[PDB]
Amino acid sequence: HFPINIEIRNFLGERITRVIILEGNSLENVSQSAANIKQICNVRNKDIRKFLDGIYVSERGNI
Amino acid sequence: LRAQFENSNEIGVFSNLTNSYALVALGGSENFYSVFEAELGDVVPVVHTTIGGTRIIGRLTCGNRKGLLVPSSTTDNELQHLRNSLPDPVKIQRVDERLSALGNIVACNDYVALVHPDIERETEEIIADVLDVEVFRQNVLTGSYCALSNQGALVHPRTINRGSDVIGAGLVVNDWCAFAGLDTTATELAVCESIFKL
Amino acid sequence: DVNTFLDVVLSRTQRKTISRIRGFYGRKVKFTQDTITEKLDSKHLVENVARDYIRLLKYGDSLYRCKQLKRAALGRMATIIKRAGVYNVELRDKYILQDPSWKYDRMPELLDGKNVADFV
Amino acid sequence: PQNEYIEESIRKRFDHEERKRKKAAREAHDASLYAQKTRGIKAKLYQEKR
Amino acid sequence: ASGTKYRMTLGLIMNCADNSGAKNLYIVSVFGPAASCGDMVLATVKKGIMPAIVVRQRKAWRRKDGVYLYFEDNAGVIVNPKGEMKGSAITGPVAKECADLWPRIASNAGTVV
Amino acid sequence: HGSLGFLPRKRASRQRGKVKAFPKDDASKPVHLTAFLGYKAGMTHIVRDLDRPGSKMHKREILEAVTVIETPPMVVVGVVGYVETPRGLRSLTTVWAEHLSEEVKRRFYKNWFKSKKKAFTKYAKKYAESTQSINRELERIKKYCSVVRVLAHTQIRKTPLAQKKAHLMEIQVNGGSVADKVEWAREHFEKTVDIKSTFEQNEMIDVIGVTRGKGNAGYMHRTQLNSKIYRIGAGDDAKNASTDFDATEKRITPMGGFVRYGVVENDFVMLNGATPGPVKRVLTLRKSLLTHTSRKALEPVSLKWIDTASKFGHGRFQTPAEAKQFLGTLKK
RNA sequence: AUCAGACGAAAAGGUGUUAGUUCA
RNA sequence: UCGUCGCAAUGGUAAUUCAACUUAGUACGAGAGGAACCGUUGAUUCAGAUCAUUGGUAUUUGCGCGGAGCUAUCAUCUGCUGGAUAACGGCUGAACGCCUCUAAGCCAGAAUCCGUGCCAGAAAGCGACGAGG
RNA sequence: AUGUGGAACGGGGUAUUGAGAUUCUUUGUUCCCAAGAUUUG
């Protein structure tokens, strides 16, 4: 219901501001970057259904 | 305009709303001041000047629309700054009276002021002359207890701001727009709007 | 669950808790009884059993006997249970002064011991 | 809303299912690691339960 | 409530400036021991336990710059436990912290200083 | 004594504040001095408005317990070369300036009247006789150094202080290359620099100094932190104690000089707060180790009026000058 | 062996192993 | 031999902080509750302190006041910060074709640890530097 | 340690005091003075 401004910001209205195909030879680094994006979009003290909206990597395949 | 400065619903205490300018006090929320600016700030300047370093200077501000005859307890530097900040048409004056909370004492409606029952007649007349509203010496804090404006803010129960006895402190009644606090009751706000022909 | 509640109570009692030996055994029994009573409030038979065990342990003669009595009381209790702020706002901008330079420029306040602003 | 509003919202994150599958596969390793690392009364209780 | 407590003269027997029928309200306890000029504190009526914002403080209250000002007496305007002024109208000077502590108390005050 | 950070408590030998940690430098930073020695002129409270977002006194005038520190422009009269060694930081060679004042030369001599006052006299000889030796020393520093610091002596003569031995402190030039640091010091040899050049007064200066001897009570070097300067008033400036609001000219020195220090004649730095050590003490004003970005550092200083009431003794007026016509004509 | 080894908390747990036996 | 101006082997460590008004009745939450959030104002306790100004001062033995200065937050300052990690959470990925925080590894991440800062310095720790035949 | 020398006075200023007195400073006076022993190098 509250869009997250992207430089992640306004995460469910969060005034705090944090820091889509991603081609890369280093698959481990690309996957690690995807995990960092998922780690950034971390819900705190929120219901799972209420926090169902999040940044999850759709797919990872060779470019 | 039933809006509360930050979480405080004492709009009249925070801001002495008058038709020409809303005598707001410094220390209020910037968004609330902008909200007061959006509601009636364009018609009534809502510059937040803390008279004598008071965030509730609007309660004690005895300056109405025609004249900013606030008490002399207001800071001279702030009053001088406000004189340059606000237009010269408002008869800005320093009411050197023992009752420094003259604005709370005087229900300075733009049509006719209502000074405190124990307020000095000379001080009331001086405030009346600047405000261009005949004073009426008549709780002693007539301005604080009952909101006063030319449009009309009805009277306190003895009530604006969720039944608060200090309607004037809760509701910043002005001739241009009878503002109030966000806590003002819907029936009370509608009655005040009906009294203000709105 | 009953087993989970008993384990939590036992863990809390362990974390919190001849005459000295008898007193220590009685204090441990009383602490366990108080924890069980508090959980039940949030039982009468358990409290009566604990009181009887405390009275029996009050006249204990050996440390082993006190330990056996405490173990029996713990077993009986187990059985019973199982049963903004940085933005700079300038007041000079909101001014009606004819000269913008004058509005943005400060004026003298006091000079040579005399209030210039209050005497001009 | 009212009553089982949370259940109604659930009826109305999808990555949890993928995470659960990853946890289920790692559950066999987690159980062995937890049992081998447990110490004290908790270790005895876990061994007795197993 | 409203406002932030600041270091000032803890003057407020706390004379009940508010027109609650009591001329003086001896401070029984400090709410949240002494209360600064304009700080509400529990006060049992001395002449004529409820909150009492010190509208006037006998002790010199260092101003914003540091200008210490001493009032005639440590007058604590009577305030209801909710926060509003228990009395109909406060008397004498009303401290700026009293306005911050309770706008109604400053509103009830005939003089604000 | 609860904080063992200052326990055990022992008196610091050197009166001058010692920079145990100089600020870190980089080539991007321009070559500049990090420390400047000052004297405790006084610390009277002066009014100043506070323009701070969210301040309860936002845009409100505040009297502030500030501190005036007499700062005679420091003279760089030499350099030291520091080689980075696996056992620590070693002094490669020290290249002094050719000519030295009697005061700094006096520092070396316990008595200075002994026989001949020969401080660096032959050194001054070989300096002029063989400038190439100094060139090689400079070359050795530029070639085999990482940390360049400059020898600096105090101009006590400008200050009203009996002490003649010029306090020498090894201020470190920071920024640029080692050769750039050597070049700046070489071109600045036997030359003085005002603190106004060293510090801009908007900068947050963690002044450090030795606490006074109480009579082990006191006498210990301490490092104040979070002390932004408020006015680096120059000595020639007689408007230094006259801000825009109190435009009337008034010297930083108030009536009755300064308490146990006398009048101020040279540059000074205005800074809020108090610092360890008694009046007229050599105080090490130095760059902040941490680039703290607190709103107090962010907000500028707009000083309302400088208090100039009487120093040692008691004064009820800002300056006698206004008091002359304020009071009736005296018997004289 | 991140509590090596060299000199009961010990029952067990070891997605800790090395060799072998049995059925396969 | 006397000094100058420095490096640091080695220890010790501090600020604990919250509390109350905005930031808030803020997103989210039917709503209540309440984030994120942002400054300010202060304060609990403890540490080093200046002694300017003020209170006290106190043989100025000057004239109760009381200079010159001392003590006293009773005038005032005043107490740091970047990595590595615990649990836990992940990426990579075998063992166990996949899978699997883990096994080789890595990252995030504690009020933890380490350094940084501060206090000292090793009377027998050293370097540069000026001045016995 | 032969000098804008240092120091003491004649003082004065600063303030104290509340018409009077006192005490950091002094282009004044004088004392002091290349001020002697000891210690090592």
PDB file of N, CA and C (backbone and C1' of nucleotides) in Angstrom, chain I residues 5-36:
ATOM      1  P     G I   5      66.509  47.941  30.351  1.00  0.00           P
ATOM      2  O5'   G I   5      67.039  46.439  30.259  1.00  0.00           O
ATOM      3  C5'   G I   5      66.153  45.356  30.007  1.00  0.00           C
ATOM      4  C4'   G I   5      66.713  44.055  30.522  1.00  0.00           C
ATOM      5  C3'   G I   5      66.180  43.600  31.872  1.00  0.00           C
ATOM      6  O3'   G I   5      64.944  42.912  31.769  1.00  0.00           O
ATOM      7  C1'   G I   5      68.533  43.506  31.898  1.00  0.00           C
ATOM      8  P     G I   6      63.647  43.452  32.547  1.00  0.00           P
ATOM      9  O5'   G I   6      63.679  42.674  33.935  1.00  0.00           O
ATOM     10  C5'   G I   6      63.703  41.254  33.980  1.00  0.00           C
ATOM     11  C4'   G I   6      64.332  40.760  35.256  1.00  0.00           C
ATOM     12  C3'   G I   6      63.746  41.331  36.540  1.00  0.00           C
ATOM     13  O3'   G I   6      62.577  40.650  36.963  1.00  0.00           O
ATOM     14  C1'   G I   6      66.094  41.527  36.605  1.00  0.00           C
ATOM     15  P     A I   7      61.316  41.477  37.518  1.00  0.00           P
ATOM     16  O5'   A I   7      61.727  41.851  39.010  1.00  0.00           O
ATOM     17  C5'   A I   7      62.096  40.844  39.941  1.00  0.00           C
ATOM     18  C4'   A I   7      62.876  41.424  41.092  1.00  0.00           C
ATOM     19  C3'   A I   7      62.208  42.578  41.826  1.00  0.00           C
ATOM     20  O3'   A I   7      61.268  42.142  42.792  1.00  0.00           O
ATOM     21  C1'   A I   7      64.435  43.166  41.314  1.00  0.00           C
ATOM     22  P     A I   8      59.963  43.026  43.106  1.00  0.00           P
ATOM     23  O5'   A I   8      60.475  44.109  44.155  1.00  0.00           O
ATOM     24  C5'   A I   8      61.027  43.714  45.402  1.00  0.00           C
ATOM     25  C4'   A I   8      61.683  44.877  46.102  1.00  0.00           C
ATOM     26  C3'   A I   8      60.816  46.114  46.283  1.00  0.00           C
ATOM     27  O3'   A I   8      59.954  46.026  47.404  1.00  0.00           O
ATOM     28  C1'   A I   8      62.908  46.751  45.397  1.00  0.00           C
ATOM     29  P     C I   9      58.679  46.997  47.519  1.00  0.00           P
ATOM     30  O5'   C I   9      59.229  48.256  48.326  1.00  0.00           O
ATOM     31  C5'   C I   9      58.544  49.499  48.290  1.00  0.00           C
ATOM     32  C4'   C I   9      59.501  50.643  48.076  1.00  0.00           C
ATOM     33  C3'   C I   9      58.890  51.930  47.542  1.00  0.00           C
ATOM     34  O3'   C I   9      58.288  52.721  48.552  1.00  0.00           O
ATOM     35  C1'   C I   9      60.817  51.399  46.285  1.00  0.00           C
ATOM     36  P     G I  10      56.923  53.514  48.251  1.00  0.00           P
ATOM     37  O5'   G I  10      57.280  55.038  48.551  1.00  0.00           O
ATOM     38  C5'   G I  10      58.543  55.581  48.189  1.00  0.00           C
ATOM     39  C4'   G I  10      58.408  56.638  47.122  1.00  0.00           C
ATOM     40  C3'   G I  10      57.008  56.852  46.567  1.00  0.00           C
ATOM     41  O3'   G I  10      56.216  57.694  47.389  1.00  0.00           O
ATOM     42  C1'   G I  10      58.545  56.674  44.780  1.00  0.00           C
ATOM     43  P     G I  11      54.806  57.179  47.961  1.00  0.00           P
ATOM     44  O5'   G I  11      54.387  56.017  46.955  1.00  0.00           O
ATOM     45  C5'   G I  11      53.208  56.124  46.173  1.00  0.00           C
ATOM     46  C4'   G I  11      53.523  56.528  44.755  1.00  0.00           C
ATOM     47  C3'   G I  11      52.409  56.313  43.742  1.00  0.00           C
ATOM     48  O3'   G I  11      51.451  57.357  43.749  1.00  0.00           O
ATOM     49  C1'   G I  11      54.430  55.451  42.879  1.00  0.00           C
ATOM     50  P     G I  12      49.896  57.029  43.981  1.00  0.00           P
ATOM     51  O5'   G I  12      49.355  56.675  42.525  1.00  0.00           O
ATOM     52  C5'   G I  12      49.434  57.620  41.468  1.00  0.00           C
ATOM     53  C4'   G I  12      49.432  56.938  40.125  1.00  0.00           C
ATOM     54  C3'   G I  12      48.269  55.992  39.866  1.00  0.00           C
ATOM     55  O3'   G I  12      47.098  56.663  39.435  1.00  0.00           O
ATOM     56  C1'   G I  12      50.287  54.908  39.313  1.00  0.00           C
ATOM     57  P     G I  13      45.647  56.093  39.823  1.00  0.00           P
ATOM     58  O5'   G I  13      45.389  54.944  38.752  1.00  0.00           O
ATOM     59  C5'   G I  13      45.498  55.208  37.361  1.00  0.00           C
ATOM     60  C4'   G I  13      45.634  53.932  36.569  1.00  0.00           C
ATOM     61  C3'   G I  13      44.530  52.904  36.770  1.00  0.00           C
ATOM     62  O3'   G I  13      43.377  53.169  35.989  1.00  0.00           O
ATOM     63  C1'   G I  13      46.634  51.843  36.945  1.00  0.00           C
ATOM     64  P     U I  14      41.909  52.924  36.596  1.00  0.00           P
ATOM     65  O5'   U I  14      41.796  51.339  36.698  1.00  0.00           O
ATOM     66  C5'   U I  14      41.984  50.520  35.557  1.00  0.00           C
ATOM     67  C4'   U I  14      42.072  49.067  35.940  1.00  0.00           C
ATOM     68  C3'   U I  14      41.002  48.580  36.899  1.00  0.00           C
ATOM     69  O3'   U I  14      39.787  48.294  36.239  1.00  0.00           O
ATOM     70  C1'   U I  14      43.116  47.842  37.645  1.00  0.00           C
ATOM     71  P     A I  15      38.488  49.181  36.553  1.00  0.00           P
ATOM     72  O5'   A I  15      37.457  48.104  37.109  1.00  0.00           O
ATOM     73  C5'   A I  15      36.915  48.239  38.433  1.00  0.00           C
ATOM     74  C4'   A I  15      37.436  47.151  39.341  1.00  0.00           C
ATOM     75  C3'   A I  15      37.077  47.321  40.814  1.00  0.00           C
ATOM     76  O3'   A I  15      35.828  46.683  41.042  1.00  0.00           O
ATOM     77  C1'   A I  15      39.404  46.999  40.612  1.00  0.00           C
ATOM     78  P     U I  16      34.762  47.298  42.074  1.00  0.00           P
ATOM     79  O5'   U I  16      35.425  47.035  43.494  1.00  0.00           O
ATOM     80  C5'   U I  16      35.793  45.720  43.878  1.00  0.00           C
ATOM     81  C4'   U I  16      36.585  45.718  45.157  1.00  0.00           C
ATOM     82  C3'   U I  16      35.980  46.526  46.291  1.00  0.00           C
ATOM     83  O3'   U I  16      34.966  45.824  46.989  1.00  0.00           O
ATOM     84  C1'   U I  16      38.260  47.091  46.058  1.00  0.00           C
ATOM     85  P     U I  17      33.459  46.379  46.982  1.00  0.00           P
ATOM     86  O5'   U I  17      33.475  47.558  48.055  1.00  0.00           O
ATOM     87  C5'   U I  17      34.178  47.427  49.283  1.00  0.00           C
ATOM     88  C4'   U I  17      34.671  48.764  49.770  1.00  0.00           C
ATOM     89  C3'   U I  17      33.635  49.876  49.785  1.00  0.00           C
ATOM     90  O3'   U I  17      32.821  49.847  50.945  1.00  0.00           O
ATOM     91  C1'   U I  17      35.611  50.654  48.745  1.00  0.00           C
ATOM     92  P     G I  18      31.223  49.743  50.813  1.00  0.00           P
ATOM     93  O5'   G I  18      30.752  51.259  50.691  1.00  0.00           O
ATOM     94  C5'   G I  18      31.371  52.282  51.463  1.00  0.00           C
ATOM     95  C4'   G I  18      31.427  53.588  50.709  1.00  0.00           C
ATOM     96  C3'   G I  18      30.073  54.236  50.432  1.00  0.00           C
ATOM     97  O3'   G I  18      30.218  55.655  50.424  1.00  0.00           O
ATOM     98  C1'   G I  18      31.136  53.723  48.382  1.00  0.00           C
ATOM     99  P     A I  19      35.311  63.410  45.712  1.00  0.00           P
ATOM    100  O5'   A I  19      34.523  63.572  47.086  1.00  0.00           O
ATOM    101  C5'   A I  19      35.041  64.381  48.132  1.00  0.00           C
ATOM    102  C4'   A I  19      35.117  63.612  49.426  1.00  0.00           C
ATOM    103  C3'   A I  19      36.131  62.480  49.461  1.00  0.00           C
ATOM    104  O3'   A I  19      37.444  62.924  49.760  1.00  0.00           O
ATOM    105  C1'   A I  19      34.054  61.683  50.238  1.00  0.00           C
ATOM    106  P     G I  20      38.605  62.831  48.653  1.00  0.00           P
ATOM    107  O5'   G I  20      39.519  61.624  49.148  1.00  0.00           O
ATOM    108  C5'   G I  20      40.284  61.735  50.339  1.00  0.00           C
ATOM    109  C4'   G I  20      40.089  60.538  51.236  1.00  0.00           C
ATOM    110  C3'   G I  20      40.745  59.244  50.779  1.00  0.00           C
ATOM    111  O3'   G I  20      42.119  59.176  51.118  1.00  0.00           O
ATOM    112  C1'   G I  20      38.508  58.815  51.412  1.00  0.00           C
ATOM    113  P     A I  21      43.245  59.221  49.972  1.00  0.00           P
ATOM    114  O5'   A I  21      44.050  57.860  50.168  1.00  0.00           O
ATOM    115  C5'   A I  21      44.566  57.492  51.438  1.00  0.00           C
ATOM    116  C4'   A I  21      44.161  56.088  51.807  1.00  0.00           C
ATOM    117  C3'   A I  21      44.650  54.989  50.874  1.00  0.00           C
ATOM    118  O3'   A I  21      45.977  54.579  51.163  1.00  0.00           O
ATOM    119  C1'   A I  21      42.339  54.705  51.279  1.00  0.00           C
ATOM    120  P     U I  22      47.087  54.529  50.001  1.00  0.00           P
ATOM    121  O5'   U I  22      47.246  52.976  49.684  1.00  0.00           O
ATOM    122  C5'   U I  22      47.503  52.039  50.721  1.00  0.00           C
ATOM    123  C4'   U I  22      46.738  50.759  50.503  1.00  0.00           C
ATOM    124  C3'   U I  22      47.094  49.981  49.244  1.00  0.00           C
ATOM    125  O3'   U I  22      48.232  49.154  49.418  1.00  0.00           O
ATOM    126  C1'   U I  22      44.742  50.180  49.417  1.00  0.00           C
ATOM    127  P     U I  23      49.662  49.597  48.835  1.00  0.00           P
ATOM    128  O5'   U I  23      50.048  48.421  47.830  1.00  0.00           O
ATOM    129  C5'   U I  23      49.940  47.062  48.225  1.00  0.00           C
ATOM    130  C4'   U I  23      48.961  46.314  47.355  1.00  0.00           C
ATOM    131  C3'   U I  23      49.325  46.211  45.882  1.00  0.00           C
ATOM    132  O3'   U I  23      50.243  45.167  45.611  1.00  0.00           O
ATOM    133  C1'   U I  23      47.073  46.898  46.089  1.00  0.00           C
ATOM    134  P     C I  24      52.150  40.633  39.820  1.00  0.00           P
ATOM    135  O5'   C I  24      51.865  41.370  38.437  1.00  0.00           O
ATOM    136  C5'   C I  24      50.854  40.906  37.555  1.00  0.00           C
ATOM    137  C4'   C I  24      50.109  42.053  36.922  1.00  0.00           C
ATOM    138  C3'   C I  24      50.971  43.132  36.285  1.00  0.00           C
ATOM    139  O3'   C I  24      51.408  42.797  34.978  1.00  0.00           O
ATOM    140  C1'   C I  24      49.347  44.146  37.663  1.00  0.00           C
ATOM    141  P     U I  25      52.879  43.218  34.484  1.00  0.00           P
ATOM    142  O5'   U I  25      52.814  44.805  34.369  1.00  0.00           O
ATOM    143  C5'   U I  25      51.977  45.437  33.411  1.00  0.00           C
ATOM    144  C4'   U I  25      51.794  46.903  33.718  1.00  0.00           C
ATOM    145  C3'   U I  25      53.062  47.744  33.733  1.00  0.00           C
ATOM    146  O3'   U I  25      53.477  48.143  32.437  1.00  0.00           O
ATOM    147  C1'   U I  25      51.789  48.215  35.663  1.00  0.00           C
ATOM    148  P     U I  26      55.027  48.455  32.143  1.00  0.00           P
ATOM    149  O5'   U I  26      55.271  49.880  32.810  1.00  0.00           O
ATOM    150  C5'   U I  26      54.510  51.017  32.411  1.00  0.00           C
ATOM    151  C4'   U I  26      54.847  52.237  33.234  1.00  0.00           C
ATOM    152  C3'   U I  26      56.266  52.773  33.054  1.00  0.00           C
ATOM    153  O3'   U I  26      56.261  54.196  33.164  1.00  0.00           O
ATOM    154  C1'   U I  26      55.920  52.210  35.318  1.00  0.00           C
ATOM    155  P     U I  27      56.728  55.109  31.927  1.00  0.00           P
ATOM    156  O5'   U I  27      58.295  55.306  32.149  1.00  0.00           O
ATOM    157  C5'   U I  27      59.205  54.235  31.935  1.00  0.00           C
ATOM    158  C4'   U I  27      60.226  54.580  30.882  1.00  0.00           C
ATOM    159  C3'   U I  27      61.162  55.730  31.215  1.00  0.00           C
ATOM    160  O3'   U I  27      62.247  55.326  32.032  1.00  0.00           O
ATOM    161  C1'   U I  27      60.303  56.017  29.031  1.00  0.00           C
ATOM    162  P     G I  28      62.956  56.371  33.026  1.00  0.00           P
ATOM    163  O5'   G I  28      61.745  57.123  33.738  1.00  0.00           O
ATOM    164  C5'   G I  28      61.819  58.513  34.022  1.00  0.00           C
ATOM    165  C4'   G I  28      61.868  58.779  35.506  1.00  0.00           C
ATOM    166  C3'   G I  28      63.032  58.156  36.263  1.00  0.00           C
ATOM    167  O3'   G I  28      64.226  58.910  36.149  1.00  0.00           O
ATOM    168  C1'   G I  28      61.019  57.763  37.441  1.00  0.00           C
ATOM    169  P     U I  29      65.660  58.187  36.234  1.00  0.00           P
ATOM    170  O5'   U I  29      65.840  57.861  37.782  1.00  0.00           O
ATOM    171  C5'   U I  29      65.974  58.904  38.735  1.00  0.00           C
ATOM    172  C4'   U I  29      65.880  58.380  40.145  1.00  0.00           C
ATOM    173  C3'   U I  29      66.881  57.301  40.527  1.00  0.00           C
ATOM    174  O3'   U I  29      68.160  57.815  40.855  1.00  0.00           O
ATOM    175  C1'   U I  29      64.726  56.653  41.234  1.00  0.00           C
ATOM    176  P     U I  30      69.486  57.134  40.250  1.00  0.00           P
ATOM    177  O5'   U I  30      69.753  55.885  41.203  1.00  0.00           O
ATOM    178  C5'   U I  30      70.051  56.068  42.580  1.00  0.00           C
ATOM    179  C4'   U I  30      69.534  54.924  43.416  1.00  0.00           C
ATOM    180  C3'   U I  30      70.278  53.604  43.286  1.00  0.00           C
ATOM    181  O3'   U I  30      71.458  53.551  44.068  1.00  0.00           O
ATOM    182  C1'   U I  30      67.957  53.211  43.126  1.00  0.00           C
ATOM    183  P     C I  31      72.649  52.546  43.671  1.00  0.00           P
ATOM    184  O5'   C I  31      72.101  51.105  44.081  1.00  0.00           O
ATOM    185  C5'   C I  31      71.844  50.782  45.441  1.00  0.00           C
ATOM    186  C4'   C I  31      71.037  49.513  45.567  1.00  0.00           C
ATOM    187  C3'   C I  31      71.695  48.246  45.043  1.00  0.00           C
ATOM    188  O3'   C I  31      72.617  47.676  45.955  1.00  0.00           O
ATOM    189  C1'   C I  31      69.482  48.367  44.234  1.00  0.00           C
ATOM    190  P     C I  32      74.045  47.147  45.441  1.00  0.00           P
ATOM    191  O5'   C I  32      73.687  45.998  44.395  1.00  0.00           O
ATOM    192  C5'   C I  32      73.073  44.787  44.815  1.00  0.00           C
ATOM    193  C4'   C I  32      72.404  44.079  43.662  1.00  0.00           C
ATOM    194  C3'   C I  32      73.326  43.594  42.553  1.00  0.00           C
ATOM    195  O3'   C I  32      73.932  42.346  42.848  1.00  0.00           O
ATOM    196  C1'   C I  32      71.500  44.751  41.603  1.00  0.00           C
ATOM    197  P     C I  33      75.508  42.127  42.619  1.00  0.00           P
ATOM    198  O5'   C I  33      75.718  42.368  41.057  1.00  0.00           O
ATOM    199  C5'   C I  33      75.027  41.584  40.089  1.00  0.00           C
ATOM    200  C4'   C I  33      75.007  42.262  38.741  1.00  0.00           C
ATOM    201  C3'   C I  33      76.326  42.211  37.974  1.00  0.00           C
ATOM    202  O3'   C I  33      76.061  42.161  36.572  1.00  0.00           O
ATOM    203  C1'   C I  33      75.743  44.463  38.388  1.00  0.00           C
ATOM    204  P     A I  34      75.869  40.746  35.834  1.00  0.00           P
ATOM    205  O5'   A I  34      77.348  40.172  35.694  1.00  0.00           O
ATOM    206  C5'   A I  34      78.059  40.306  34.474  1.00  0.00           C
ATOM    207  C4'   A I  34      79.427  39.677  34.537  1.00  0.00           C
ATOM    208  C3'   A I  34      80.327  40.171  35.661  1.00  0.00           C
ATOM    209  O3'   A I  34      80.120  39.466  36.872  1.00  0.00           O
ATOM    210  C1'   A I  34      81.488  40.318  33.614  1.00  0.00           C
ATOM    211  P     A I  35      79.826  40.259  38.238  1.00  0.00           P
ATOM    212  O5'   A I  35      78.481  39.598  38.782  1.00  0.00           O
ATOM    213  C5'   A I  35      78.109  39.723  40.147  1.00  0.00           C
ATOM    214  C4'   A I  35      77.785  38.383  40.756  1.00  0.00           C
ATOM    215  C3'   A I  35      78.444  37.178  40.105  1.00  0.00           C
ATOM    216  O3'   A I  35      79.788  36.995  40.510  1.00  0.00           O
ATOM    217  C1'   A I  35      76.155  36.721  40.474  1.00  0.00           C
ATOM    218  P     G I  36      80.829  36.240  39.547  1.00  0.00           P
ATOM    219  O5'   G I  36      81.537  35.185  40.508  1.00  0.00           O
ATOM    220  C5'   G I  36      82.104  35.596  41.743  1.00  0.00           C
ATOM    221  C4'   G I  36      81.712  34.670  42.866  1.00  0.00           C
ATOM    222  C3'   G I  36      82.178  33.229  42.735  1.00  0.00           C
ATOM    223  O3'   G I  36      83.525  33.046  43.133  1.00  0.00           O
ATOM    224  C1'   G I  36      79.894  33.263  43.330  1.00  0.00           C
TER     225        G I  36
END
